[PDB]
Structure 1
Amino acid sequence: GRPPRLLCVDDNPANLLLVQTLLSDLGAQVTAVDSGYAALEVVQRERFDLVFMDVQMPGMDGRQATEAIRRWEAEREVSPVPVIALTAHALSNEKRALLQAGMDDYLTKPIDEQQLAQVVLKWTGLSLG
């Protein structure tokens, strides 16, 4: 299959570089942005197969960024992109809030190639590495 086009969103530069490097080495075409504000702007510009969205970010958090994307998708009329929460905060009540905000799934930090590969396959049908 063709390489998946993936967006990674994280306010922690080390966390962002880690997920971006794992996905790029698995053969994905990766865009990486440092904020929810950037996530909205780049999802308007580019068509991604899937978005990895950090939850805790200042100003606009992951849930607010996903709501912004869902509002723009409905108003602009664009096929919805799968949004996967990728966070250190994934308790039962936090999971519920993420799905309520319009996210599709969640992974817990720290990430690994196996978790990324399986979630991309589940939601896009595209394989990695």
Structure 2
Amino acid sequence: AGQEILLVEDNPVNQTVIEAMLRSLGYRVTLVADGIQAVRSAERQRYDAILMDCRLPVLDGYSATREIRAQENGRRVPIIALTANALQGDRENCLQAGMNDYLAKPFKRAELQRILQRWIGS
């Protein structure tokens, strides 16, 4: 039916907007809203890619990404950070966690399309 994307996003409107962009591109989307849920979803299913928002409740993007990279198949899954502060706080935290790439919010549907193809076809 389509490639499987884990979208890790805590903000309700970004959840709506980014899930809609992904479903418009033909992806199957699993949405989770915090780092704890990201680590469990990744432990239990192979995803084609994970979109990891940097700032999350419970467990942040840095910690979730570290924990996924320590799992047997999270070791290799493409993880693309979503950053709204690619300019300071996130460069000095989330973006050092083991990301393949990052999107800067606010981003375009075409940018999302471009970055997923880059990694799912890498």
Residue 109 of structure 1 corresponds to: 105
Percent identity (aligned): 40
Conserved 8 A contact 1:95-1:106: no
Once the 2 structures are TM-superposed, how far is the Cα of residue 118 of structure 1 from its aligned partner? 0.6
Query: Aligned runs of 1:29-108 on 2, under 5 Å?
Result: 29-71=28-70, 73=71, 77-78=72-73, 80-91=76-87, 94-95=90-91, 97-108=93-104
Task: Tell me the residue number matched to 1:7.
Answer: 6
Provide the aligned C-alpha RMSD in A: 1.9
> 4+ runs of 1 displaced by more than 2 Å?
92-100
Query: Distance in 1 between the 2:14 and 2:89 partners?
Result: 23
Aligned to 2:7, what secondary structure does the other structure show?
strand
Query: SS at 1:94's partner residue?
Result: coil
Query: Which runs of 5 or more structure 1 residues have no equivalent in the other structure?
Result: none
TM, length-normalised to structure 2: 0.89
Number of aligned residue pairs: give it.
121
Equivalent residue, structure 2, for 1:17: 16
Q: Which has the bigger relative contact order, CA under 8 A and spacing at least 6?
A: 1
Q: 1:94 deviation in Å? A: 2.9
CA distance in 1, matches of 2:17, 2:43: 25
1:28-74 Cα deviation digits (max 9, x unpaired): 11111010000001001111110010111123110110001012x2x
Please identify which structure carries the higher helix content. Answer: 1
Query: Tell me, which stretches of 5 or more residues in structure 2 are unaligned?
Result: none
TM-score by length of 1: 0.84
